[PDB]
Design a protein around this nucleic acid. Structure first.
Ligand SMILES: Cc1cn([C@H]2C[C@H](O)[C@@H](COP(=O)(O)OP(=O)(O)OP(=O)(O)O)O2)c(=O)[nH]c1=O
Ligand SMILES: [Mg+2]
Ligand SMILES: [Mg+2]
Length: 342
DNA sequence: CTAGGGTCCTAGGACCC
DNA sequence: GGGTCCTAGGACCC
């Protein structure tokens, strides 16, 4: 009863799209991200920029200190969505069992596939080659019996490569696998695990599930399972979007309600346009606002509401401004909607 | 020097039975 | 004295 799971993941996605569409950028360091003057961060960088240490989520000021010649690009999201739709269509030539996780990646369950004599290795290779042939972008892939191992494997031979983990190989692979490599084990969890002597899956294997449950709750069961190669999560294919948000960080902090209200007036039309694409009648479950202060604390306040309404979002932002700000400057204003459940 | 797009989990009181 | 809704926060993912 062993499944075959592929994880396909585009290489340096946004940057690879920009280098294809403008070959002038192929061999200089580039990154998509907000300017230093906009208090931006890097969305991603090409390999010439990564060589200097430039990474996703890095503050753009730090990126530019590491790489003074970095070319900063704003981003063309319709171009990325176009490439995304294309690779998902390519995935569909092989199976309907597709769970996209983001624009540039997806799980595929090819257990019941007849392509390539049932070879998940050869299916992954064909998909990667077809994506290069049709989009002139490269992808990496991982092949494993369960989701999380397939996703880890897709990183091990990138760019433009793949890695296969068989059941026979799972114990040796897990023994030294750092817990931080597990999707969902982030910096905070890894530091808590490290402070109790747990670094790798091999370490967690020597642990009592009951202690893990007590110390981490439901997350402790996940850690226990994953550390043994256990991951029964099915490839879904029917997941739907549950929210839409629109937020902006200002170049300077704001200190006056008039400035906040002015920012909302620009955010609202964008929220309405994006909601309408998926809910033409604007009917929703909740709406709300987000403020982020200069001490980086953030607050949200949202409430049951039947239909997108600008004045109520202003009114709510006014309350939040008056009630939870405590005289701090504000660096971000955001609007938010929770979608009806079907 | 710290984005913008999201998902998921936790947790207290409200409301219900 | 349990189940679910409402709400806020926060880790985490891309
Ligand atoms: C991680 C990350 C990605 N993104 C965007 C830009 C990425 O190109 C796109 C897909 O993310 P990833 O697949 O995580 O990264 P990548 O494609 O740029 O590089 P890699 O070859 O290592 O896979 O999502 C962000 O905007 N912010 C982020 O923090
Ligand atoms: Mg990628
Ligand atoms: Mg990806």
């Amino acid at each position: 009863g062993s499944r075959k799971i592929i994880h396909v993941d585009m290489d340096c996605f946004f940057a690879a799209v920009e280098m294809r569409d403008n070959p002038a950028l192929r061999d200089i360091p580039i990154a998509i991200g907000g300017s230093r003057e906009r208090r931006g961060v890097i969305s991603t960088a090409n390999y010439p920029a990564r060589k200097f240490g430039v990474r996703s989520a890095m503050p753009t000021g730090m990126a530019l200190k590491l790489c003074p010649h970095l070319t900063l690009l704003p981003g063309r999201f319709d171009a990325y969505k176009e490439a995304s739709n294309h690779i998902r269509e390519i995935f569909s030539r092989y199976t309907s069992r597709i769970e996209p996780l983001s624009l540039d990646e997806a799980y595929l369950d090819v257990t019941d596939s007849v392509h390539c004599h049932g070879s998940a290795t050869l299916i992954a290779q064909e998909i990667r080659q077809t994506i290069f042939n049709e989009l002139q972008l490269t992808a990496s892939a991982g092949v494993a019996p369960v989701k999380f191992l397939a996703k880890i494997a897709s990183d091990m031979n990138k760019p433009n490569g793949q890695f296969v983990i068989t059941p026979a190989e799972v114990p040796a692979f897990l023994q030294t696998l750092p817990l931080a490599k597990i999707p969902g084990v982030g910096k905070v969890s890894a530091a808590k695990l490290e402070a109790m002597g747990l670094r790798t899956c091999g370490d967690v294997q020597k642990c009592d599930l009951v202690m893990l449950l007590k110390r981490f709750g439901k997350f402790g069961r996940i850690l226990w399972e994953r550390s043994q190669g256990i991951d029964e999560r099915d490839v879904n294919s029917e997941r739907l979007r549950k929210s839409v948000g629109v937020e902006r960080t200002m170049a300077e902090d704001i200190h006056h309600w008039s400035e906040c209200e002015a920012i909302i007036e620009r955010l609202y039309p964008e929220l309405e346009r994006r909601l309408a694409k998926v809910k033409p009648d604007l009917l929703i479950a909740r709406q709300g606002v987000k403020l982020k202060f200069d001490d980086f604390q953030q607050t949200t306040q949202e409430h049951v509401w039947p239909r997108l309404n600008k004045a109520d979002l202003i009114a709510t932002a006014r309350k939040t401004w008056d009630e939870r700000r405590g005289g701090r400057g504000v660096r971000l204003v955001g609007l938010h909607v929770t979608l009806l459940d079907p």
